[PDB]
Amino acid sequence: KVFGRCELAAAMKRHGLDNYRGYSLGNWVCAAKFESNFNTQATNRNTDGSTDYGILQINSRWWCNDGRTPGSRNLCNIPCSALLSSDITASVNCAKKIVSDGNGMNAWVAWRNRCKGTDVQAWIRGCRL
């Protein structure tokens, strides 16, 4: 599923992500934009052999099981395939664990490089929320 910008903002809000760990909704929408272009089915292999999954490109090295990332963990206790669903519940619940891990949203390198410090409210501007 390819979400619309305001559609995803509303789904993220419904699943409790707005201001989660102090990160406003626009931060989450901005991160999803540059991780996946709002496509729940996005996958991207990493040089280390892990794979990133879903709207927030959650990595198999630590967070989900895909059966092919040697020495990895599954700290969200989910198959990585669950992160590709049209229903964003699994991605949101796992992102809550990731953003609580110590470095906030810097865990998402693209958030640090393309969202951090910018006018992230632009990503929810005009949306009925």
Ligand SMILES: [Cl-]
């Ligand atoms: Cl957009």
Ligand SMILES: [Cl-]
């Ligand atoms: Cl917010």
Ligand SMILES: [Cl-]
């Ligand atoms: Cl915002």
Ligand SMILES: [Cl-]
């Ligand atoms: Cl594995």
Ligand SMILES: [Cl-]
């Ligand atoms: Cl584990």
Ligand SMILES: [Cl-]
């Ligand atoms: Cl599994």
Ligand SMILES: [Cl-]
């Ligand atoms: Cl959803």
Ligand SMILES: [Cl-]
């Ligand atoms: Cl923080």
Ligand code: NA
């Ligand atoms: Na894993």
